Design a protein around this ligand. Structure first.
Ligand SMILES: NC(=O)c1ccc[n+]([C@@H]2O[C@H](COP(=O)([O-])OP(=O)(O)OC[C@H]3O[C@@H](n4cnc5c(N)ncnc54)[C@H](OP(=O)(O)O)[C@@H]3O)[C@@H](O)[C@H]2O)c1
Ligand SMILES: O=C(O)CSc1nnc(-c2ccc([N+](=O)[O-])o2)o1
Length: 315
């Protein structure tokens, strides 16, 4: 099916358009093209600095009646410098204003790590360590819960939370709403079997980010593995008469994940959506799972001493 049921009773499109690194000059057209070719979920974030332009596309397509608001599933994320309970509503409201929306379908805590509030997204001391916030995950969560109760967001969730941090929210005293989604990096080099099973066993839907391995990541290195160029994955694609990207997108779909490939290229936006017409075998799936090497696109080194840094733990 095209959507998965969340624990808030709403349905989430299992394919979304990513927007991290989408240049502000190209992302309006990218989102317009995506909605024209069937996408109904857009993944956004304030820290991506392009929500105004994403919003321009969404508003044009609503105005043109290409789509109804209820048919769209718009996701954004609370940045690290806004974990303070008094800053969360404003941060949500800024995103809503930029996206030109009156609600979000899903609002995520972008990272478990809270940073010192200010203009700077990564406030630094003088050695390059990020300056933390003394706010913890649970008070931030309560602030996310207020957003539901004020009508600004239909669902709340988390991102880059490890097993122990998901468990800490689930066990929060007085918990009012469980997280609906945990959005985490996931692809055949970082298969995440343990965290995904835990999350799904608790009724939390997992969204897979960087499913193509983020070839446009700013810190890429030549020696780095490349999913898109992996001859083993190309072979599975050839067998199925599909591209390597389409296999990489179908793979998490068949693990009951949501997946959010990014492109600003019209032809690739369309290609990436054409993944509902073929099936990977269980052997294919087990084969792709076997390529795991615990390789992460997203592990900022600048936050490794933060107390809530999520990736010291086995998962
Ligand atoms: N929660 C968080 O912490 C977090 C972290 C990372 C990512 N995410 C979200 O997840 C989304 C996806 O992750 P990502 O942006 O890191 O990378 P990705 O989706 O794995 O890869 C994007 C790269 O792949 C290229 N590409 C797209 N379709 C292609 C195709 N069919 N064939 C060949 N190349 C193709 C894109 O190029 P062009 O754009 O030039 O076409 C771009 O360089 C992000 O945009 C963001 O929305 C969330
Ligand atoms: O966040 C994205 O969507 C891409 S930009 C990014 N990558 N890694 C970070 C981050 C923030 C906190 C941590 N941390 O590792 O504690 O890492 O920000």
């Amino acid at each position: 099916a095209s959507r998965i049921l969340l624990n808030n009773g709403a349905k989430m499109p299992i394919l979304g358009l990513g927007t991290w690194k989408s240049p502000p000059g190209q992302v309006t057209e990218a989102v317009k093209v995506a909605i024209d070719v069937g996408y109904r979920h857009i993944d956004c974030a304030h820290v991506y600095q392009n929500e105004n332009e994403v919003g321009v596309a969404i508003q044009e397509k609503l105005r043109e009646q290409v789509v109804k608001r209820e048919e769209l599933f718009i996701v954004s994320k609370l940045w690290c410098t806004y974990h303070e309970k008094g800053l969360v509503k404003g941060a949500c409201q800024k995103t809503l204003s930029d996206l030109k929306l009156d609600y979000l379908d899903l609002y995520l805590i972008h990272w478990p790590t809270g940073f010192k509030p200010g203009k700077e997204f990564f406030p630094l001391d003088e050695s390059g360590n990020v300056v933390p916030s003394d706010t913890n995950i649970l008070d931030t969560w309560a602030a996310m819960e207020e957003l539901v109760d004020e009508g600004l967001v239909k669902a709340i969730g988390i991102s880059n939370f490890n097993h122990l941090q998901v468990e800490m929210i689930l066990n929060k005293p007085g918990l009012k709403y469980k997280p609906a989604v945990n959005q985490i990096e996931c692809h055949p080099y970082l298969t995440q079997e343990k965290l995904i099973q835990y999350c799904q066993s608790k009724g939390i839907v997992v969204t897979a980010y960087s499913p193509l391995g983020s070839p446009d990541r700013p810190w890429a290195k030549p020696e780095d593995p490349s999913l898109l160029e992996d001859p083993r994955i190309k072979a599975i694609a050839a067998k199925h008469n599909k591209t390597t990207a389409q296999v990489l997108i179908r793979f998490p779909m068949q693990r009951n994940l949501v997946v959010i490939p990014k492109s600003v290229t019209p032809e690739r936006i369309a290609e990436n959506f054409k993944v509902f017409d073929f099936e990977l075998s269980s052997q294919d799936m087990t084969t792709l799972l076997s390529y795991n090497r615990n390789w992460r696109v997203c592990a900022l080194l600048s936050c490794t001493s933060h107390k809530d840094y999520p990736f010291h733990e086995e998962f």
